[PDB]
Design a binder for this molecule. Structure first.
Ligand code: WD0
Lengths: 300, 237
């Protein structure tokens, strides 16, 4: 179990750790989060009491170094930073624990939610989408645009997502126009899964990464990306049975975890009614369809 | 974006554009079978590709053989249209290729757009107008070449005959839509009106009668009356 210490908490802020969050008051004596399960990727995220504009946060994997948070009063945000002096880090941590100023990552043992939302999230790939090679952790916020939002303007602060475009020569073989536009299996199976992702677990990884960025930061371009990666499967007649089953599990937990109140901006009616009722896979997402019908029947 | 009465005059500027109407691409007669069930039989059809500035009509005729062994023909038809228009554009010298293609029906946009990916600079646009191009098969010499074709076949017409010698493209387009609208609402009367006086002929190389300027005014008025009339007879006013 690892620890993400905080130098201090000078401004009132809502802190999030994965799917948990708690309120910290302006100069309440807070010194970080303990008992974080190793073996998964994590996200620690912020929303200032004063300016609910800008949710922002850091993807990190504890196995890749010792990370802490320190507020920067020039840039006005809680920054993630790496400690290379290992003994200085174990020492700082131990003192804050002994004085019990850290909240505990509060995992119920029955609960697999986090694993189920992050099974395919890879931290080293995350770095090659949120490009910033001098940090082992990755910053995202609400307002970061994607590479494809920028094709339609600062490239260092972009989300380099896997560009999907259904009216593109990538997607449409010459002479197979009608066929490839109505059944995208060639774009999915050969172009993307065989030529770009390498395998489906990678396809699921970016798809999972997109959703979480959407959910945790209200990042609109990540929402677009999540729906497109879904649309591409739902619009393909030939999908490996095992991908379909995992996708049904993947979405089920995404829909389970979505706030009941954010559905109107984070769910795309067109894409879902296609997956669930119109498209090739209308009969292939039983778990996802049941939860969507019982939780958000208004959308459909 | 889309085309309506407000940007109506753009049609007659000097950027090359074509209208595509796919209404008459897939045509069927519906009949009963010996077992008393219903079946369709396809008949030849056509794509109606028109340059409104010049009058040039690229009539691509769609022989029934193109449907043999195909399923979901109404949807195929839209893609078949898109293939043929793309093929048409590719066959044109660059300076003859259009800068816009306006589809008469919104369902054609994706099929054409997908077929035109190689031409990113050619705008594919819908329109809000209720243009009467489906009545083009009420034009005897068009209906004839379509029904007689034995193979796919492209045939070039000028749908304005020699009108541009005496009037503008704007007026020529207005006459054509008036004629076609009349033909669409009451083919029989529309045609009686055009051909009553056997002393006005249709030259072998034209589609419409050789009316004088004054005779065209009388024609145009009678076609208006017909369209109003038929609108009364239809709405009882
Ligand atoms: C650079 O590769 C383009 C295809 N994407 C991947 O391989 C990813 C795998 C897992 C991911 N987890 C998080 S983000 C991500 C991307």
């Amino acid at each position: 179990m690892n620890t993400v210490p905080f130098t201090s908490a000078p401004i009132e802020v809502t802190i999030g750790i994965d799917q948990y969050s708690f309120n910290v008051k302006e100069n309440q004596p807070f010194h970080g989060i303990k008992d974080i399960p190793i073996g998964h990727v994590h996200v620690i995220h912020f929303q200032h009491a004063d300016n609910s504009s800008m949710r922002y946060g850091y993807w990190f994997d504890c196995r890749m170094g010792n990370f802490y948070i320190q507020y920067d009063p020039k840039d006005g945000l809680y920054k993630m930073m790496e400690e290379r002096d290992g003994a200085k880090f174990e020492n700082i941590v131990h003192n804050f624990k002994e004085r019990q100023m850290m909240v505990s990552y509060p995992k119920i043992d029955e609960d697999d939610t986090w694993y189920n939302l992050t099974e395919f999230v890879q931290m080293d790939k995350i770095r090659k989408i949120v490009r910033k090679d001098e940090n082992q952790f990755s910053y995202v916020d609400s307002s970061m645009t994607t590479v494809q939002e920028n094709e339609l303007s600062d490239p260092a602060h972009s989300l380099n997502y896997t560009v999907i475009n259904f009216k593109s020569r990538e997607a449409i073989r010459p002479g197979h126009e009608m066929e490839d536009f109505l059944d995208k299996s060639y774009y999915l199976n050969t172009v993307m899964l065989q030529g770009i992702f390498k395998n489906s677990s990678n396809y699921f990884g970016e798809l999972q990464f997109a959703f979480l960025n959407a959910m945790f930061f209200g990042n609109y371009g990540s929402s677009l990306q999540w729906h497109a990666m879904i649309e591409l499967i739902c619009s393909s007649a030939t999908v490996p049975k095992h991908m379909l089953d995992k996708l049904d599990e993947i979405l089920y937990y995404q829909i389970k975890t979505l706030p009941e109140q954010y559905s109107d901006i984070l769910l795309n009616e067109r894409v879902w009614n296609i997956c669930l009722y119109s498209s090739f896979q209308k009969n292939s997402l039983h778990n996802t369809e049941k939860i969507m019908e019982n939780k958000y029947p208004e959308l459909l | 974006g889309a085309m309506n009465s407000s940007n109506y005059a753009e049609l007659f500027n000097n950027d090359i554009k074509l209208f595509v109407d796919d209404t008459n691409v897939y045509r069927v007669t519906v009949h009963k079978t010996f077992e008393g069930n219903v079946a369709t039989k396809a008949i030849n059809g056509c794509i109606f590709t028109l340059n409104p500035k010049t009058g040039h009509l690229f009539l691509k005729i769609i022989h029934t053989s193109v449907w043999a062994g195909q399923k979901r023909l109404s949807q195929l038809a839209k893609w078949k249209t898109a293939e043929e228009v793309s093929a048409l554009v590719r066959s044109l010298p660059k300076e003859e290729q259009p800068k816009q293609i306006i589809v008469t029906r919104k369902a054609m946009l994706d099929p054409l757009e997908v077929h035109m990916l190689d031409f990113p600079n050619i705008a594919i646009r819908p329109t809000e107008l209720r243009l009467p191009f489906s009545a083009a098969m009420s034009i005897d010499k068009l209906s004839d070449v379509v029904m007689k074709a034995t193979e796919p076949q492209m045939v070039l017409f000028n749908i304005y005959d020699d009108w541009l010698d005496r009037i503008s493209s704007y007026t020529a387009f207005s006459r054509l839509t008036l004629l076609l609208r009349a033909l669409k609402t009451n083919e029989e009367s529309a045609k009686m009106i055009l051909l009553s006086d056997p002393t006005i002929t249709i030259k072998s190389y034209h589609l419409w009668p050789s009316f004088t300027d004054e005779q065209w005014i009388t024609i145009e008025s009678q076609m208006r009356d017909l369209i109003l009339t038929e609108y009364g007879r239809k709405y009882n006013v």
